[PDB]
Structures are given as structure tokens and as C-alpha cells.
Amino acid sequence: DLKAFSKHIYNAYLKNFNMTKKKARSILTGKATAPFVIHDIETLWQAEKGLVWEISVHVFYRCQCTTVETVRELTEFAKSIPSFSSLFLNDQVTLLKYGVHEAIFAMLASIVNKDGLLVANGSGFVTREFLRSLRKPFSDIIEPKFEFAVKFNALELDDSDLALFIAAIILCGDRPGLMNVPRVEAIQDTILRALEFHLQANHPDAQYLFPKLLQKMADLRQLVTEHAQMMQRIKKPLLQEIYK
Numbered sequence: 001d002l003k004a005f006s007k008h009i010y011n012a013y014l015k016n017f018n019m020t021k022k023k024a025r026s027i028l029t030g031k032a033t034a035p036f037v038i039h040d041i042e043t044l045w046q047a048e049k050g051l052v053w054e055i056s057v058h059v060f061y062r063c064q065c066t067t068v069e070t071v072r073e074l075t076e077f078a079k080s081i082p083s084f085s086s087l088f089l090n091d092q093v094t095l096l097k098y099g100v101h102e103a104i105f106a107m108l109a110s111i112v113n114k115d116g117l118l119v120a121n122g123s124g125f126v127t128r129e130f131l132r133s134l135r136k137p138f139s140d141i142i143e144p145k146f147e148f149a150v151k152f153n154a155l156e157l158d159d160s161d162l163a164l165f166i167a168a169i170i171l172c173g174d175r176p177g178l179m180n181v182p183r184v185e186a187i188q189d190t191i192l193r194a195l196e197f198h199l200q201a202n203h204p205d206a207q208y209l210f211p212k213l214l215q216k217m218a219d220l221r222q223l224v225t226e227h228a229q230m231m232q233r234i235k236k237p238l239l240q241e242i243y244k
């Protein structure tokens with residue numbers, strides 16, 4: 001039942017995202033190739049030009065590129081939950097369009113540690129203090145994501161926890177302009193029932209983790225709100241996914 005539902009969604013995750021958290025930690029701690037460090041202008045330039053052969057404006061462009069693949073991954077992850085696919089086009093568009101941002105940040109925690117973040121599907125590691133050395137308000141906008149992720153990562157979540165968690169962020173009954181509110185509220189309810197089951201089996205002694213995770217969702221929301229607001233003060237394939 002609920003053990004098997006957790007597992008079904010764990011599969012669509014593994015099948016739809018290339019950088020699992022396991023893969024991430026594997027590289028950061030170096031199992032068996034070591035990421036190219038970017039700590040300054042020289043190394044950033046090498047990572048763009050070649051290792052052998054404005055600056056605020058380039059780090060930020062690179063943050064936006066990542067997103068293109070991430071959204072594609074989410075849309076598929078999403079569409080691979082059968083309940084999601086049984087929803088009407090208008091509902092599916094609304095759910096991805098409001099969810100993706102929270103999810104994109106929830107997942108970012110996977111590739112982030114105290115010292116920096118993995119880049120170029122795993123082959124580069126840009127350092128936190130290089131990122132802090134950028135002019136405002138560009139560094140104003142990257143820091144609150146590092147702060148969220150370090151907090152987030154302290155919760156010891158693993159891919160199978162994350163899979164449900166992302167399912168919960170997308171399938172969310174509060175999104176503005178949903179047509180079938182009660183249907184979305186029912187599915188989440190299930191995704192939530194099972195998240196809770198999962199956590200209390202897979203984190204037997206972390207006893208306030210679920211209500212902690214719920215706070216993280218509220219927290220993520222606020223983090224997007226502010227991200228939208230900060231971006232304002234700065235620049236001043238298939239049918240459905242071409243829409244989100």
C-alpha cells in the first residue's frame with residue numbers, strides 16, 4: 001500500500017532526474033572524477049573558454065541555464081505520477097508553473113554544501129566565497145539559497161525522502177486558478193500520508209521531521225516570493241512543457 005506508493009514515486013524520480021542526491025554526495029566526497037574548482041575569475045574563464053585553450057551577468061546566466069533541464073525533468077517526473085496525468089490540462093499547467101520554482105530550489109540543496117555548489121552536471125564546483133565576491137545585488141540573491149540549503153541538508157533527507165517531497169511540492173491544492181481543487185487536495189493528501197509513513201520508517205528516531213518538512217515547504221514558498229522580488233529590482237518540446 002503506502003510502502004509501495006513511496007517506492008513507485010521513488011522510481012519515477014530515479015528515472016527522471018540525473019543528479020540524484022546520492023550521486024551528488026558521491027562526487028562532493030569524491031568516490032570513483034574530481035570536479036574542476038572555480039574560485040576566481042581565471043578559473044571561471046577557463047570553465048567557459050577551455051581548461052587548456054560583466055561577471056555578475058555570467059554567473060546568473062549560468063544559474064538560468066540549469067533550470068531548462070531541471071524543469072524538463074520535473075515535467076516528466078510529474079507526468080510520470082499517474083494521478084497527475086489524469087488531471088485536466090489547465091490544472092497540470094497551473095501546478096507546474098507555481099510548483100517548479102520551489103522544487104528547483106528544493107533540489108538545489110542536493111548539490112550544495114557549506115563551501116560551494118556543484119556545476120556542469122557534476123564536473124565543476126563553484127565555491128561559496130567566490131559567489132559571495134560578486135557585486136550586489138547579485139550576491140544578495142544567491143546567498144539566501146545557500147542558507148536554506150545548509151539548513152535543509154542538516155535534516156539528513158535522502159533521495160527516497162526527496163522523491164515524495166518533490167511530489168508534494170507540485171501536487172499542491174493552494175495554487176491560484178486551479179479548476180479541480182478537491183481532486184488535487186486528495187492526491188496530495190495521499191502523497192502526504194505516504195511521506196509521513198516513509199519518514200517514520202526511514203528516520204525512526206527523527207520524530208518531528210515531517211512537521212519540520214512541512215515548514216520547509218512554507219519556507220520555500222517565501223524564498224520564491226523574495227526571489228521574484230529581487231529579480232525585479234535587478235533587470236530594471238511537447239505542448240505543456242513549452243508552456244511552463
Ligand SMILES: O=C(O)COc1ccc(Sc2cc(C#CCN3CCOCC3)nc(C#Cc3ccc(C(F)(F)F)cc3)c2)c2c1CCC2
Nearest residue numbers: 019059062063064066070107108110111119126141142145
Ligand atoms: O535567473 C534567476 O532566476 C536568478 O538566478 C538563479 C536561477 C536558478 C537558481 S536554482 C539553481 C539550480 C541549480 C541546479 C541544479 C541541479 N539540480 C537539478 C537536478 O537535481 C539536482 C539539483 N544550479 C544553479 C546554479 C548555478 C551556477 C552558479 C554559478 C555558476 C558559475 F560558476 F559562475 F558559472 C554556474 C552555475 C542554480 C538559482 C539562481 C540564483 C540562486 C540559485
